[PDB]
């Protein structure tokens, strides 16, 4: 329904990530993920793995990174109507729990494809290309820049 | 009985998938792909896995 | 754990120093008290 | 601050496997929602709604479309559950128009039969004063046809009656302040009337869940606005002593003022505000009070004064005491109540005062009767009768409901029953459902609420008679073993 029915905050998309279940929502979702990854009869279990991470890993960005604005009509005249939903979390707070849990997870999932991949350098790479894309915009310093003008608007 | 039972349950789903709201089209989208999922893990655990929960399976029926 | 051991020398050096940085990296995440909140004022 | 008696609430934690369930749910419906909108971009599907002229095709687009987005994939598909017509007087029986969709909600087209006598659980009249026979209608019909309807200018200008007058100077009895000043809108007493109180270089401090009108009156004020937990007077004090202290943010200097909002009776939540805390807090600190007292000044309290009369406090302690005329007395208005020369700068430096037509007539002599009765100037035996059902009322459904195994929010006393769903689906299965049984709720869903919490509102009510409460109570117990909605743990 409308915002600000049934409380006064203006954007309800900075503690969507601060509920409850939600940490645990998520690692369901990606253990789900590698479930029916495995269920594909033909892969072996390494490319399994380096599916999980880089799938996992685009969908992550794709969604924190790349989406701006809110779904829906906000009452403070879109002040987020260029921001991301990672700029967006915690309305700006730099190190939050959220955060740093959304922030360890895909190093540990890339910790476990690179313990079952048996340290192939064609996975390193691929691993190690998407483990910097996600990363990287995650760090304080790039708040807010868009390189070249992309995505800008 | 059992019909309305079965009925009861699939109402259930629809409610907690949220399939409820949506129009007959993609409630056939979502069970096709479902169904196609449980099927094909079915297929992966008979093929490669050992049949050892077929053997548990049988035991309860016995 | 022998054989956990056994896997990680199997690794090449770069692998194993990447893995550490990272490692250090989220010691860091974890150990990062201050709740820094990205604002710069001054006065007129 | 103490209390002269116990102050129960009860806000039960959302059990681990409904949240991940409701995670499920939320998710299908966004990945469905994208799936939608990528079909109809690439007009693969018909799209069925209203497209810009063709003489604008070369302008900026009006809207932005992501914004919307739940609009068009979660609130259109339960669309009916809101919007739904009345041909009647909103008492405890209530008649619908009834309407069905072809194009699932997208247009809604009108069938000639009407739904009779549905159960109103979704009104606002607490203590049945929304009737078209009685005292209080054939005074409205005598003043209409005197003074006509609606006055055709401002109270500054020509358009200030003797009606006003009265209704001002009875206002300021019944709640025993000195002086009062009465708008002709609930919404427009805060939106302006806040902005004139404060101004830059001070500061509010707002309850988290304050209403609209509220936040917009501080908005349109230049004050620096910060939020605290609600009814969390940890918070309030910890908010306190860093503005005392710490000053302006960038040029630290000691603010202006203070001013602190609070609500009587907070609707969708349930609870009633913990108003010796807050008297206490504004005491130690030096703070003033703003008091939305929409929601409790007819439900509360043994003769109906308010949060300020249950407590059991002083009404001189209260620097604001709003309300409004709708949810009680049965008539759109509203009020501010306090010192005179409050309301004396109020009357020169009001928006409302200066800009916007007053009261109409037939409304202020609605307010005066009932507001007479209430306070017992006509002599009969009602107006106590009103209140003393109204609490039994209240407290038989909500002990009645808490024991049938469901989740509610709130304390024992507000009138106001927040039941919990916690699904998408589930609000308009519960809706589409109670309406089926010839009940009628109000059903509230994600961006209004947090994500987990989704609710359906019971408002009671003094019309409200055991044989009714009886059957909605069978009804929901029913609808519940339909549906599972039967979440708590502690008792079932
Ligand atoms: C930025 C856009 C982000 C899109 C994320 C897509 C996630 C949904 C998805 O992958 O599956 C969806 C495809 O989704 C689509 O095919 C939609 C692709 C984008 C459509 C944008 C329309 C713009 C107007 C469909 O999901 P499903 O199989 O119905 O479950």
Known sequence: MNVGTAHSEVNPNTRVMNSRGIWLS???????????????????????????????????????????????????????????????????????????????????????????????????????????????????????????????? | RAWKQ??????????????????????????????????????????????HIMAILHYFEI | LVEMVQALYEAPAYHLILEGILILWIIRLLFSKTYKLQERSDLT | GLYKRPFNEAFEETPMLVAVLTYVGYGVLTLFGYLRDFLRYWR?????????????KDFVSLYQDFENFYTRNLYMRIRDNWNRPICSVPGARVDIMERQSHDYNWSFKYTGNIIKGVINMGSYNYLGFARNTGSCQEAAAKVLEEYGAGVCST?????????????????????????????????????????????????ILSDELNHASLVLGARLSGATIRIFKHNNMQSLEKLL???????????????????????????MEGSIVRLPEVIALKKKYKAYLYLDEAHSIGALGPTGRGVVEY?????????????????????????????????????????????????????????????????????????????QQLAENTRYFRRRLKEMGFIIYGNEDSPVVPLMLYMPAKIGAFGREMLKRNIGVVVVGFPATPIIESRARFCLSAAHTKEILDTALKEIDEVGDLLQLKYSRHRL
């Open chain 1, 26 to 153: 998520y690692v369901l979702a990606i253990g789900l993920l590698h479930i029916v990854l495995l269920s594909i009869p033909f892969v072996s279990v390494p490319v399994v793995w380096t599916l999980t991470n880089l799938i996992h890993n685009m969908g992550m960005y794709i969604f924190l990174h790349t989406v701006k604005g809110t779904p829906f009509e906000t009452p403070d005249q879109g002040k987020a109507r260029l921001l991301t939903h990672w700029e967006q979390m915690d309305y700006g707070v730099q190190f939050t729990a959220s955060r740093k849990f959304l922030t360890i997870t895909p190093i540990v999932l890339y910790f476990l494809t690179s313990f079952y991949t048996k340290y192939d350098q064609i996975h390193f790479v691929l691993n190690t290309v998407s483990l910097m894309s996600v990363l990287i915009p995650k760090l304080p310093q790039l708040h807010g820049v868009r390189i070249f003008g992309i995505n800008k608007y």
């Open chain 2, 6 to 51: 079965m009925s009861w349950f699939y109402y259930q789903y629809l409610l907690v998938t949220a399939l409820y709201m949506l129009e007959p089209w993609e409630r056939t989208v979502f069970n096709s792909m479902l169904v196609s999922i449980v099927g094909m893990a079915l297929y992966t655990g008979y093929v490669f896995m050992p049949q």
């Open chain 4, 44 to 56: 693969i599907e018909k799209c069925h709604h209203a497209t810009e002229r063709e003489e604008q």
């Open chain 4, 155 to 203: 109270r500054q200008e020509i358009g200030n009656l003797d009606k006003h007058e009265e209704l001002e100077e009875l206002v300021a009895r019944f709640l025993g302040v000195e002086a009062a000043m009465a708008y002709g809108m609930g919404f427009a007493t805060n939106s302006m009337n806040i902005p004139a109180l404060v101004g830059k270089g001070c500061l």
């Open chain 4, 241 to 267: 002593k860093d503005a005392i202290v710490y000053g302006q943010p960038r040029t630290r200097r000691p603010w202006k003022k203070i001013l602190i909002l609070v609500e009587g009776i907070y609707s």
């Open chain 4, 311 to 387: 407590f059991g406090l002083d009404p001189e302690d209260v620097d604001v005491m709003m309300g409004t005329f709708t949810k009680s007395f049965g008539a759109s208005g509203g009020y501010i109540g306090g010192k005179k020369e409050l309301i004396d700068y109020l009357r020169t430096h009001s928006h409302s005062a200066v800009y916007a037509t007053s009261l109409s007539p037939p409304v202020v002599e609605q307010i005066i009767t009932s507001m007479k009765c209430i306070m017992g100037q006509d002599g009969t035996s009602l107006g106590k009768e009103c209140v």
